[PDB]
Amino acid sequence: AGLLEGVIKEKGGVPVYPSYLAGEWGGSGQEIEVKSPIDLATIAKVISPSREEVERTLDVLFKRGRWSARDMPGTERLAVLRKAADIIERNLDVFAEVLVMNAGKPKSAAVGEVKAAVDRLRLAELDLKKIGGDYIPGDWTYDTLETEGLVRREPLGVVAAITPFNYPLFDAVNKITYSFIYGNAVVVKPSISDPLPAAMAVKALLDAGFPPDAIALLNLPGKEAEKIVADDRVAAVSFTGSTEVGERVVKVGGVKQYVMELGGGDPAIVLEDADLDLAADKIARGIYSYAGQRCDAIKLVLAERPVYGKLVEEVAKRLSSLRVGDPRDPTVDVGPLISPSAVDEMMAAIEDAVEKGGRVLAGGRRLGPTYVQPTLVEAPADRVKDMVLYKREVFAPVASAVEVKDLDQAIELANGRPYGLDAAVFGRDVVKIRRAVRLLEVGAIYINDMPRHGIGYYPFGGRKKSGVFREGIGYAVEAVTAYKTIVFNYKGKGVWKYE
Amino acid sequence: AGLLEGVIKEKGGVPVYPSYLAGEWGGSGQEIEVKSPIDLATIAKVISPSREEVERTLDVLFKRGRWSARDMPGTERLAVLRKAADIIERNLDVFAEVLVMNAGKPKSAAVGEVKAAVDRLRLAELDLKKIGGDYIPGDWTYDTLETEGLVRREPLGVVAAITPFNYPLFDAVNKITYSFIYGNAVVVKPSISDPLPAAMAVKALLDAGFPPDAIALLNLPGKEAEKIVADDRVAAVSFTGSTEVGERVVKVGGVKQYVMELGGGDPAIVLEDADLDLAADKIARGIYSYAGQRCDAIKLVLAERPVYGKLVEEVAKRLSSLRVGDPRDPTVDVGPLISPSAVDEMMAAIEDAVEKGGRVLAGGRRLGPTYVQPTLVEAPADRVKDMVLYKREVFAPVASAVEVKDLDQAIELANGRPYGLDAAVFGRDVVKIRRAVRLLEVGAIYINDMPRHGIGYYPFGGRKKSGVFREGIGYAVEAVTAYKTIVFNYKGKGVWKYE
Amino acid sequence: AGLLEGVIKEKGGVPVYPSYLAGEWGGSGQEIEVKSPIDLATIAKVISPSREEVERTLDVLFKRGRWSARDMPGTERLAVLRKAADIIERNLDVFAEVLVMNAGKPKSAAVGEVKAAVDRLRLAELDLKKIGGDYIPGDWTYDTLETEGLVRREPLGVVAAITPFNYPLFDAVNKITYSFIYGNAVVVKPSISDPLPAAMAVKALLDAGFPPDAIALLNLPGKEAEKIVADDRVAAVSFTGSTEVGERVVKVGGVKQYVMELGGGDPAIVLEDADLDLAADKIARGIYSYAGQRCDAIKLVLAERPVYGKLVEEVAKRLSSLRVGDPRDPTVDVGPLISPSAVDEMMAAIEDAVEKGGRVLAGGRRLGPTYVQPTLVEAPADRVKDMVLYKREVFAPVASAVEVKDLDQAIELANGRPYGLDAAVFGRDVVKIRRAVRLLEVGAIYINDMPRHGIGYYPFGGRKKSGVFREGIGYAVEAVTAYKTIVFNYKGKGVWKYE
Amino acid sequence: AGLLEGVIKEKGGVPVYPSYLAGEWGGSGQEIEVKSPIDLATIAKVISPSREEVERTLDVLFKRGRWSARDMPGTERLAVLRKAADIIERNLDVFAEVLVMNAGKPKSAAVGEVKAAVDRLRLAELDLKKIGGDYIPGDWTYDTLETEGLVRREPLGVVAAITPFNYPLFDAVNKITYSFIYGNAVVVKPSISDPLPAAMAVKALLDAGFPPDAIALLNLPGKEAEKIVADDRVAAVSFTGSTEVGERVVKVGGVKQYVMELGGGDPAIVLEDADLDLAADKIARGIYSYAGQRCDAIKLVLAERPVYGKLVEEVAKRLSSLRVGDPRDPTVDVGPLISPSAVDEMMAAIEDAVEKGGRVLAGGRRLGPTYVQPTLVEAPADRVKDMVLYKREVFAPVASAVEVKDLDQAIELANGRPYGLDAAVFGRDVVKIRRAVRLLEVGAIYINDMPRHGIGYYPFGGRKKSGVFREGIGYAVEAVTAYKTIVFNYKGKGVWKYE
Ligand SMILES: NC(=O)c1ccc[n+]([C@@H]2O[C@H](COP(=O)([O-])OP(=O)(O)OC[C@H]3O[C@@H](n4cnc5c(N)ncnc54)[C@H](OP(=O)(O)O)[C@@H]3O)[C@@H](O)[C@H]2O)c1
Ligand code: NA
Ligand code: NA
Ligand code: NA
Ligand code: NA
């Protein structure tokens, strides 16, 4: 609605959302149904581009787009991003509604994501703490005397932004922002599961002045996107999703610049030192927020003997007092999961933990094809490692709780999972905290708080199976930019006497 | 000889070089013959590790090596690198000899590479202009108030260094240096074509104090290395080689941090402004140095109408006055190519240019299975683009020469190849130079000089098919290092009043 | 008018502007007449604070102000600066009028300064490319093992901003912006000659949300300001003015952080290579803009034999075709000088040049107590050095022109003055330009353009008698900020194994 | 002895040390007696230069020196500094002896300073993490489109290094190192009290290859140095000394770049959280090291109620168990103070504290004209602020001890002195530590350790009366370097399309 006034096709009673082919909205490939996880009902259809349209779109992005983006003064690109922020802001409710409608996101969360997208856009000003270059004098080596170097960052060209389902609006806006602020053209490929928010963001950007040939939004389902990734006109692939799909993306893409935010869960460690009120509060939230459909969601709780009982007790009470229902009730805390399949896996996973010695301390009851109570499962250290909930990321509101002897055991268990995205540590002793910070093999550690990538004010990314590289204001530049070195030779000319 | 005193096996009359399995020299896989391109005679054999030894080596590097490298104080790692420099230096002649023996490198060039390796090691001090981290205050956003960020760079763990044949000693030393200075363990995989220099460097490093379990040298032929690349204990792959093999490496490795120096040739542009003496001199060298077996070798010469004649004339004279023979004669300018196959391709390539309108202006005569004269082939702009010498990188001493109307045509042709490593521009006008610098799509541009990565005093790397990321003192850190973000939450505590 | 609605006192027919005493507008010291250089008529009066009010103001700034500025989140300080930009923008005409009224600035120039002030405020976002800190690992020295360093920049406290007459609005806004963006409180001391624009800027800032106790505007005449400079509650003095007054400021202030932009003229060099059209245009402007009352004004023109004639010819024609009159005529090019005294000095200076062999090539005629034609005086290299116009900065629209043999003589003469603010070089040859850049002893060199500090997009400042330190977006932080180092000792604790 | 073989004049039985006049050792001004604080006996004489020799020396440094230093390739300057390190190292004992002889420094301390000087020299490699420059694109503002900026750091020219008495060798070496590594010429002015170590360092540097006209060592007593400071050929003054002399230096020098390390004492805070063993140990040392003749010496101890008793108890025991005597006994802990006057002030200061309610807890007994026991004086919070030991820096081994209610009172008292050099905080709670770090107004805070500038691995400097700017590896560059901005204008040329 609204922004997509003349774009959306009212056909067969259901709104039809077209792909944006770097110049004109359209598409003539298969139409795909977009369902809401709230009622499993079709809320719209998206037109996927045909193979020829994908080909033509990439051709336009490559031959015209990257130059349109690059030739637009940085000061103007920023203006575009700021105007788009204004547009999204005044259309907040419609944007939030779609997030609730399409992603099953609780009203307040949906509003939070729209605001995050808006802030991210406005902070593009801070993404400049990085586009400056370096000057290198040549007199620190005899071979380089009477020589000089200039190292500048330049945009790579066409960046493919591949987005997961859990933060459809923000991720698209985020990847588009850091790719565009530096002069790249962008091909957005949203999850076919919830591509509507991206269509709205893209539209807002186009209305804001975004070079019409420098951006594309292709509604291609999963494997159909490989055509974009494998193409040589795509210099970089910014991907946020599962470890398995990310692996496939790299293998399909080959040599190319990548940003792989592959998530997985995050462990939380509570030292005997911690404020248990703060810890229980933040840990409970980290477990249930958006029905645990957050890569930075808490999946494992580790607490030392002296505080384990009280901590898990408080977290259990907070979880069980949560209202699960229609994300439309500003009263509901937890909406549905993206699909019934996601819930199936969570139940099977809980069964696995229980079979292996685990005990549910809160939740555990499925409430419908796509509804479940955020669950907390207790587990003995000697058996937790073999449980699916530990070895894998069950994208749902569920976490293991484990009592530990000391910090070293906490760290050991925390590092025992195959992932390494973030980790949380609640405590007050600087030495123990410093040790945890040193030994936790993750991209980010949150001291006295739940893991929260937020809008990327602080850089984040993975270690181990959680991926490579970082996103964040100012740090994402590394993935969508390339250095250009210019060496000047003045040997023999009379510039320098001896140096 | 020398350093490898008790390591090399004198068996069957031929010296047998063993792999270094992160702790002990050995191996029990197939023995492979190492031949000299000077006479095509076997000069040694290398023992490739068996599958179980590769497995065990990776296990050691992962479980012990990365910690030994990381736990060694940076100041000590530097001491090791400096001691190794001392050792290689006093063993210069033996190192140079092997480069001449095994790589067919002219005496002076071999000496140059040993010195480059020595300097690179000693400059590890300058690789520190990057291991420092960032402090991020949280008051530039309301959501981050009473919060702070600390971003540190940490080593990734186990880096796989894969080296090409053309600079066996330097590349190994270089990749080991920047991987180790930051705390990584390293698995070196040299070209089976000339693995001897690496064995000597590794030995020198081990004698210098390099953690014995933090380094490995595996003599595995081509595809046998995929076992190292595909392994999850290898967090990064530093690869220098052909575009095609690099592509295979990424597809085999999957998600991982990469540095892909994929070479290709470099075009040289001469403006009517240029000092033609300097230009002819540098361009001639760029074409023939090490029989053109340099990724930064000149493969295409573009000169404006008014200077084309004189320029190509002078370059032709310099090339034809070159002495081709045994790299052992301090009198020889050009030794043999690495293999007769390499020469076959160069002759076929020349034939192609001639068939398509090209004309040899110098050289063109094969002198033996692995010897050829550095060749310069003239070609009309209207036909050069379809010639193999243009569309491809013929790793040999051969370059196309093309007359152009103006800078724009020079740039067009320069950018018309599928590669984008470096480019050279000879001229004096700041505006034309600035324009060339803006439009040349390459990782590095050399003003008034031949392209020379040298020891990486200035960062270099590719665009387009020449790869991704950069090597260079201080810049290589990006590929073998990862950020670790630590966010401290002080909300509610009495640290800050309002900010 | 406007913003100062309830502030300005309508007394005795003339508007009376009060000082802002960090909380309330007022003052009870001597009232001082403010005259326009357009007609020498009193246009207003300013109330200077009494000694007790200065004392009380400093006390407030120190005891409350620096905390109010520091405790306001950076994100809020930026909001204040942006709101103030909005206010000044919608009040553009009134701001421009006062600049014309009070400074005798040509209409378009006045509009340019208001816009510059507005842009400077809005770019405060880019002043953040510097408030981030550094993290220093301790393992690069054995003595520092198991130790770490955190280096943050903090505001100094109370910064005294002392402004000259030539850019009353911008300078005040500029110094306030970079002092405040980082958390400092500010005491503005404008030239008693034209303090009105500052009063308006300060008012706009206060209306924008600027902490009322964190800013002060004291209308103190010259030496009366020493009371502010000498006070220990003033941690930094940002001063832009004459070399002689700056010297006095430091001697009165003692140990303290300083930014001394002491101006002086700038020499312009034209190589036989230069586009003479561009050169004549830019040089003419550099000589006359704002009746040469610009620290970055061109005061000496040096051109090589082959272009000297044409260059000076064209510059002379441009100068003589200038309309001198009331800055109110959008038709006038040059308004009056700030005072008749300034004109007296310019005439005496011209007389000196003529007596010493100089010859007027354009202008030279005084048109009134405060009006004169922008003048160009030719002079032989062998005598120019002893002329007052060379040895000194005659703040007026006048410049010496001198023919030179080659670049070396140009540089010699350019460096022969006691100043070293900027220098301009018109030419195209990279080698000659690089040499000029190396040998010109100045803070900034402009290639193919007149010197233009502008809003400080690029940092600028002096060498030799032109002062110390730099202003500019991102660079001014050094003068109003201080480092705070935090060293953490973990020796003996179990954080690190060996490193 | 040794290095000064042919330099020192054996006249009248006492060794006569000449000034180094930037080219030749000599001098013809008054000869001055240099006494040892060990026995008050003359151990040598130094020749101060005459006014004409000072004039000539400055002329040489300015006209030749700054170019010799600047024209020497950075790589060579580093070689010089490293060679000098080698020379000082092999002459360690002689250097240490002079420190013991001339400064009354305990044997181990003297050895520590020689080693510090040696390390500082060798770490000059790390002073390079700063001489690189910045490249600034012009498309972030419309006015700067088609424009670019290059900002390089250049040496200022002649730096005057003024050294205090307490670390004669290190300070001279340190200031010379960071001034020279960047290309400056240096005039060293050591304390006439102990100028011998500087003469030896300078000699070692000259033997190492230091440009003979780029360095000078003038033995001028106190006020006689103003001639160097006030001279316009001296672009920067690096001064370490008393607040009062520093003030005089700035007032004599006028506009110039300064580094003012003005010391004062440091307060130490111990939270109920602290390891009291570590705290007592470090605090005791901080109080007595080099008889408290350290700017980073502990002068005030603040401990919370619950640990005050035990802490002060342990510190008292450590102090009273100290052996005071001839610094030559590797058995002595504390040698003499620099002069009997220094001891007089310490006794008077103790008397003052006692008269105002203070009580000596350890030491307090004078042992000779220049010997005293390191003293610890207890004082009630309600009276400590008026005691001389609090309000002033009594350069001697003496500190006040004060019990406090909580962190806020500790901070209040810590900030109540007029100085702000460093501060120490022993404790473990991250929140309390973070708060202390925020509120302590000092240049450096040491967590769980005594303040130790060391060789400047971490930057340090003052706040309030302790001075301005910082010294430290990599940070000292700001004081002896200046930016040079080069702006290139390409407006109208065909470099850029629109951006
Ligand atoms: N971009 C740069 O900075 C740069 C610098 C120097 C050279 N180069 C390029 O490198 C080439 C010269 O070296 P080269 O001819 O020896 O090229 P190459 O064949 O591409 O070198 C490949 C390296 O990878 C190993 N390898 C081969 N197949 C592999 C596989 N399937 N999996 C894992 N590793 C494998 C090779 O070992 P084996 O030798 O045992 O097969 C060799 O050590 C040229 O194309 C040149 O342009 C680029
Ligand atoms: Na590919
Ligand atoms: Na993989
Ligand atoms: Na003062
Ligand atoms: Na002065």
Short mmCIF file of all heavy atoms in Angstrom, two decimals, chain C residues 110-137:
data_model
loop_
_atom_site.label_atom_id
_atom_site.label_comp_id
_atom_site.label_asym_id
_atom_site.label_seq_id
_atom_site.Cartn_x
_atom_site.Cartn_y
_atom_site.Cartn_z
N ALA C 110 28.68 37.89 1.66
CA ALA C 110 27.97 37.77 2.92
C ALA C 110 27.09 36.54 2.87
O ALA C 110 27.02 35.77 3.83
CB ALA C 110 27.13 39.01 3.18
N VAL C 111 26.41 36.34 1.74
CA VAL C 111 25.54 35.18 1.60
C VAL C 111 26.40 33.91 1.64
O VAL C 111 26.00 32.90 2.22
CB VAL C 111 24.74 35.25 0.27
CG1 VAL C 111 24.04 33.92 -0.01
CG2 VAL C 111 23.70 36.38 0.38
N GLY C 112 27.58 33.99 1.03
CA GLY C 112 28.49 32.86 1.02
C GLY C 112 28.93 32.48 2.42
O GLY C 112 29.01 31.30 2.74
N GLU C 113 29.20 33.48 3.26
CA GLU C 113 29.64 33.19 4.62
C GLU C 113 28.52 32.58 5.46
O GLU C 113 28.76 31.69 6.28
CB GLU C 113 30.17 34.44 5.31
CG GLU C 113 30.74 34.13 6.70
CD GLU C 113 31.34 35.34 7.38
OE1 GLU C 113 31.80 36.26 6.67
OE2 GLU C 113 31.39 35.37 8.63
N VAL C 114 27.29 33.05 5.26
CA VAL C 114 26.18 32.49 6.02
C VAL C 114 26.03 31.03 5.62
O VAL C 114 25.85 30.16 6.48
CB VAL C 114 24.84 33.22 5.74
CG1 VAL C 114 23.72 32.51 6.46
CG2 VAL C 114 24.91 34.67 6.21
N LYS C 115 26.12 30.76 4.33
CA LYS C 115 25.99 29.39 3.83
C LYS C 115 27.14 28.51 4.31
O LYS C 115 26.95 27.33 4.58
CB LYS C 115 25.92 29.38 2.31
CG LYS C 115 24.60 29.90 1.75
CD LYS C 115 24.55 29.78 0.24
CE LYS C 115 23.20 30.22 -0.32
NZ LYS C 115 23.15 30.11 -1.81
N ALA C 116 28.33 29.10 4.42
CA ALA C 116 29.50 28.37 4.88
C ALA C 116 29.28 27.99 6.34
O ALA C 116 29.55 26.86 6.75
CB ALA C 116 30.75 29.23 4.75
N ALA C 117 28.78 28.94 7.12
CA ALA C 117 28.53 28.70 8.53
C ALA C 117 27.50 27.59 8.68
O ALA C 117 27.63 26.72 9.54
CB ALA C 117 28.04 29.96 9.20
N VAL C 118 26.48 27.63 7.83
CA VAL C 118 25.42 26.64 7.86
C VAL C 118 25.96 25.26 7.49
O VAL C 118 25.63 24.26 8.16
CB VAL C 118 24.25 27.04 6.89
CG1 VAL C 118 23.31 25.86 6.64
CG2 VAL C 118 23.46 28.21 7.49
N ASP C 119 26.77 25.19 6.45
CA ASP C 119 27.36 23.92 6.02
C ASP C 119 28.31 23.38 7.09
O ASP C 119 28.30 22.20 7.40
CB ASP C 119 28.13 24.08 4.71
CG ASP C 119 27.23 24.30 3.52
OD1 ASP C 119 26.03 23.94 3.61
OD2 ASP C 119 27.72 24.81 2.49
N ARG C 120 29.15 24.26 7.64
CA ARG C 120 30.09 23.84 8.65
C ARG C 120 29.35 23.16 9.79
O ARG C 120 29.77 22.11 10.27
CB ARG C 120 30.86 25.05 9.20
CG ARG C 120 31.87 24.66 10.26
CD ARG C 120 32.97 23.79 9.66
NE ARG C 120 33.87 23.28 10.68
CZ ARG C 120 33.67 22.16 11.38
NH1 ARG C 120 32.60 21.40 11.16
NH2 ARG C 120 34.55 21.80 12.29
N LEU C 121 28.23 23.75 10.21
CA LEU C 121 27.43 23.19 11.29
C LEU C 121 26.92 21.81 10.94
O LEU C 121 27.01 20.89 11.75
CB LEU C 121 26.24 24.10 11.60
CG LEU C 121 26.55 25.37 12.39
CD1 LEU C 121 25.39 26.36 12.24
CD2 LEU C 121 26.79 25.01 13.87
N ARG C 122 26.38 21.67 9.73
CA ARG C 122 25.83 20.40 9.29
C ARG C 122 26.87 19.31 9.07
O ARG C 122 26.54 18.12 9.11
CB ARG C 122 25.02 20.61 8.01
CG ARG C 122 23.70 21.30 8.27
CD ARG C 122 22.89 21.60 7.01
NE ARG C 122 21.59 22.13 7.40
CZ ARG C 122 20.89 23.02 6.71
NH1 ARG C 122 21.35 23.51 5.56
NH2 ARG C 122 19.72 23.44 7.19
N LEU C 123 28.12 19.71 8.84
CA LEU C 123 29.17 18.73 8.60
C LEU C 123 29.83 18.25 9.89
O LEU C 123 30.79 17.48 9.84
CB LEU C 123 30.21 19.31 7.64
CG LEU C 123 29.67 19.42 6.21
CD1 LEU C 123 30.72 20.05 5.31
CD2 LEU C 123 29.26 18.03 5.70
N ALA C 124 29.32 18.71 11.02
CA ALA C 124 29.85 18.32 12.32
C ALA C 124 29.84 16.80 12.42
O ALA C 124 30.55 16.21 13.22
CB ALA C 124 29.02 18.94 13.44
N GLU C 125 29.02 16.18 11.58
CA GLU C 125 28.93 14.72 11.54
C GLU C 125 30.30 14.16 11.13
O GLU C 125 30.71 13.10 11.60
CB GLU C 125 27.88 14.31 10.51
CG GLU C 125 28.05 15.05 9.19
CD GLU C 125 26.98 14.72 8.19
OE1 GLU C 125 25.81 14.58 8.61
OE2 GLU C 125 27.30 14.61 6.98
N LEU C 126 30.99 14.86 10.24
CA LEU C 126 32.29 14.42 9.77
C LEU C 126 33.41 14.74 10.74
O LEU C 126 34.55 14.36 10.50
CB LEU C 126 32.60 15.04 8.41
CG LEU C 126 31.62 14.75 7.27
CD1 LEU C 126 32.15 15.36 5.99
CD2 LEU C 126 31.43 13.26 7.10
N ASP C 127 33.11 15.45 11.82
CA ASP C 127 34.13 15.77 12.81
C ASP C 127 34.28 14.56 13.72
O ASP C 127 35.08 14.57 14.65
CB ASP C 127 33.73 16.98 13.66
CG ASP C 127 33.96 18.31 12.96
OD1 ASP C 127 35.12 18.62 12.63
OD2 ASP C 127 32.98 19.05 12.75
N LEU C 128 33.50 13.52 13.44
CA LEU C 128 33.54 12.31 14.25
C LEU C 128 34.57 11.31 13.77
O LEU C 128 34.90 10.35 14.48
CB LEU C 128 32.15 11.67 14.29
CG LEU C 128 31.09 12.68 14.73
CD1 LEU C 128 29.76 11.97 14.90
CD2 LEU C 128 31.53 13.34 16.03
N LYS C 129 35.08 11.53 12.56
CA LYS C 129 36.11 10.65 12.01
C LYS C 129 37.34 10.80 12.90
O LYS C 129 38.45 10.52 12.45
CB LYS C 129 36.51 11.08 10.60
CG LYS C 129 35.49 10.84 9.50
CD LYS C 129 36.07 11.31 8.17
CE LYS C 129 35.15 11.00 7.00
NZ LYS C 129 35.75 11.44 5.70
N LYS C 130 37.14 11.24 14.14
CA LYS C 130 38.27 11.45 15.03
C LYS C 130 38.07 11.23 16.53
O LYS C 130 39.05 11.05 17.25
CB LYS C 130 38.82 12.85 14.80
CG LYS C 130 39.30 13.13 13.38
CD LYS C 130 40.69 12.56 13.10
CE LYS C 130 41.25 13.09 11.77
NZ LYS C 130 42.68 12.72 11.54
N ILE C 131 36.84 11.24 17.02
CA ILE C 131 36.68 11.07 18.46
C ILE C 131 36.82 9.62 18.95
O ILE C 131 36.73 9.36 20.15
CB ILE C 131 35.35 11.67 18.99
CG1 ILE C 131 35.43 11.83 20.51
CG2 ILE C 131 34.18 10.79 18.58
CD1 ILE C 131 34.34 12.68 21.11
N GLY C 132 37.03 8.69 18.03
CA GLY C 132 37.21 7.30 18.42
C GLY C 132 38.61 7.15 19.01
O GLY C 132 39.50 7.95 18.71
N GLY C 133 38.81 6.13 19.84
CA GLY C 133 40.11 5.94 20.46
C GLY C 133 40.90 4.74 19.97
O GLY C 133 40.51 4.06 19.03
N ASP C 134 42.02 4.46 20.64
CA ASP C 134 42.87 3.35 20.26
C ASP C 134 43.03 2.27 21.33
O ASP C 134 42.99 2.55 22.54
CB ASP C 134 44.28 3.85 19.89
CG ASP C 134 44.26 5.00 18.89
OD1 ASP C 134 43.59 4.87 17.83
OD2 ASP C 134 44.91 6.03 19.17
N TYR C 135 43.20 1.04 20.88
CA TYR C 135 43.43 -0.06 21.79
C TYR C 135 44.87 -0.50 21.53
O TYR C 135 45.23 -0.78 20.39
CB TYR C 135 42.50 -1.23 21.50
CG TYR C 135 43.02 -2.49 22.15
CD1 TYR C 135 42.87 -2.70 23.52
CD2 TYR C 135 43.73 -3.43 21.41
CE1 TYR C 135 43.41 -3.82 24.14
CE2 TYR C 135 44.28 -4.56 22.01
CZ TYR C 135 44.11 -4.75 23.38
OH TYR C 135 44.64 -5.87 23.98
N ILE C 136 45.68 -0.59 22.57
CA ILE C 136 47.07 -0.99 22.38
C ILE C 136 47.42 -2.27 23.13
O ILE C 136 47.45 -2.29 24.36
CB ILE C 136 48.02 0.11 22.87
CG1 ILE C 136 47.65 1.45 22.23
CG2 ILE C 136 49.45 -0.26 22.55
CD1 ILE C 136 48.48 2.61 22.74
N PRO C 137 47.70 -3.35 22.39
CA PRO C 137 48.06 -4.63 23.03
C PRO C 137 49.45 -4.46 23.64
O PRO C 137 50.26 -3.68 23.12
CB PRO C 137 48.05 -5.61 21.86
CG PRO C 137 48.56 -4.76 20.74
CD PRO C 137 47.80 -3.45 20.92
#
